[model samples]
Target chain A: SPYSAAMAEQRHQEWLRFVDLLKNAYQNDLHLPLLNLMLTPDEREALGTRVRIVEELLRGEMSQRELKNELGAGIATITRGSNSLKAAPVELRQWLEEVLL
Target chain B: SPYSAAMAEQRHQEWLRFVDLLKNAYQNDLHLPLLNLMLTPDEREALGTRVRIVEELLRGEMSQRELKNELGAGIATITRGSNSLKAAPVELRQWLEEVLL
Candidate 1:
């Protein structure tokens, strides 16, 4: 278990480097090149769905139940989107605030 | 429209290079370094859940309806896992075959 924990920490460190790279590139008006490179078309589409789900959640505009009714998506999917919003990059959070009204 | 098309193509090309790098790295029993780098903890957990969901689907061991009842996950989440199985990298697919029985 300790070995696995070490491996996980190493993984987390490696991932933080990628996050740093993206952080350097992220900007209000810029396209996300690293993200484009990292995600497949299907993944990108799923992320778009997640974004829309989070957008609704952020504005207090819709409940999870309502989202399920509206989008016909699963609760698990919506909860994942919610978690992503909670952990989203600060810039993206600010951007959401700017655009989600 | 064409300008955006060109940009999208360029983005796709960039992504292809990343995919090539990943393809070279993926092997049976090897850790997915690029994937670990690309995904956050939450994202990784979601993916793991997706993997388990796909595993159940592939074995004919569980219906989506059954999975929803069992896991309290949404239909969309299950569908995404299904799609991932359909589009999973060849090695991962092979690995799944080896392990899922």
Candidate 2:
């Protein structure tokens, strides 16, 4: 039973750390290139590009290529836009928040 | 004027689309590598890798080389475990469906 408790406590500590990471990342606007964990340079670079595209997109004016040429973006970047327009959920409040603003 | 209403509506639509995208990505476990938005390819992959590392770290077993070699992970992945060992939050059981479980 004591061994079991120790295991559970270890697991709990792990979860706590995960949550802390999320909070920290969330507070930072979720902009960190966190996934670069054990990946190769190519993998890291590819993922990072996708994220950058979204950031520029939100800023209001920068074509994909402009973002690409200037920021080294990629086609996956377009996926972000594609999802937003083609398959996003229909949330009344989200739409309303902007309208009301 | 109607143009203002239309622009506001368009922007709100954009927000809805974005949230929907997040939910879809979250549900599919697809890990599309999102960022604040508008970053380059390297940036997108990097972020995804970071997210991946966290995912693996949560799974309970997978050493640095094991994750990197087998799962294409990176140094950032190792950080996930280190972070997990350190922080997070504390939440207790709550009522579900108006009854305590």
Candidate 3:
């Protein structure tokens, strides 16, 4: 229905705006406090390791199991990185292509 | 030092890629499971209310105190939304300019 379409569009617009707000905050470092709070020393270590594992995965230099073994991270952690790569944005993909490939 | 600058660049690149990955997942709803896990019914209610409050705030049609009174949300909730609006992405800001202004 027209009303339903309008409602969906409105919701989509709202979400877009919300995402925009967050992105701006991120770029401006407005949300740094929250991000820093959410990350503890342990979380920071895990995040750093995950970043490395994901970088390798993006480079296509290692299989998931191989990465898990090499990094000594849990399978779940490795899988999470894999999933994140699959869902990464075009900008990130392009960067990976240039640097890794 | 040159090495420090290089390290910073590498870290910045890594963070950019990470943000891209999360944005893509958000657009594709790939992280719904984690989001759902993080959001319980109570949390959902709070989020919805916050969204509404932020919308009104962005519209510039109401003061923060007024919004709190009208929405019956906590001051902390209102402040959070306000902070988010300040940090939102460019796309969101443009949309708000078009429809919300």
Candidate 4:
């Protein structure tokens, strides 16, 4: 189904299968090497930027003005990440707290 | 360290710290939502393509030419992924086997 996914249900099923492989990869500590093999330089930067943007927003140490200059990201973009912060699961908040610490 | 890493040792140290945070996220089953929150549509497609390219190469039913057509990817691209197939850890192979099943 990787080659094509014409149906909604089939695509969802395939994504679940893919996610299972991904989660197992993480559990076995293979995710890092595996991701390195797959990601391009730009992708590496973009994903990290997004992650850090969300983390910084949640940490609440930096003002949006400072973040704007520091991250080279726009207010709307920062707001976008900040929006997800509220609904983030307890596990993620703890993870972010550990990261920021 | 996310903002910038000017030195070699510092960069590696920062990457390890980031990886630690990432691994914990996975352990808590938060990686999926976190990634979905961070990734753009094109980034999503690109990463999945790379992951599936590696997976299909490891599975090895199709010839490189066949893969090129099926994946809409070039021979060099398939060869590139195929090259990494040999060094993949035992756990990854088992994970792929489970997925392909």
Candidate with top lDDT is 4
Where is model 3 chain A poorest over a 10-residue stretch in terms of lDDT? Answer: A34-43
Among these predicted structures, which one has the highest DockQ? Answer: 4
Clashing pairs in 3: A20-B88, A20-B89, A21-B87, A21-B88, A21-B89, A22-B88, A24-B88, A24-B89, A25-B87
Model 1 DockQ (Cα-based): 0.04
Q: How do the predictions measure up, each by TM-score?
A: 0.41, 0.29, 0.38, 0.68
Per-residue lDDT of B52-89 in model 1, one digit per residue for the tens? 56557878877889986665579987776676567655
The 0-to-1 C-alpha lDDT of every candidate, in the order given, reads: 0.54, 0.43, 0.57, 0.66
Winner of 3 and 4 under TM-score: 4
When 3 and 4 are scored with DockQ, the better candidate is: 4
Q: Could you tell me how far off, in angstroms, the CA of residue B11 lies in candidate 4 after the best superposition?
A: 5.1
lDDT, residue B86, model 4: 65
Off by over 4 Å in 4: A1-10, A72-80, A83-101, B1-18, B73-80, B83-101
Residue pairs that clash (backbone atoms under 3 angstroms), model 1? A74-B74
- The iRMS of the candidates, in order, is 11.0, 10.9, 8.3, 3.3
Colliding residue pairs in candidate 4: none
**RMSD of each predicted structure:** 13.4, 14.3, 9.4, 4.5
TM score of chain A per candidate? 0.62, 0.38, 0.57, 0.69
lDDT of 3 by residue, B34-65 (tens): 23322233433444455567568868988889
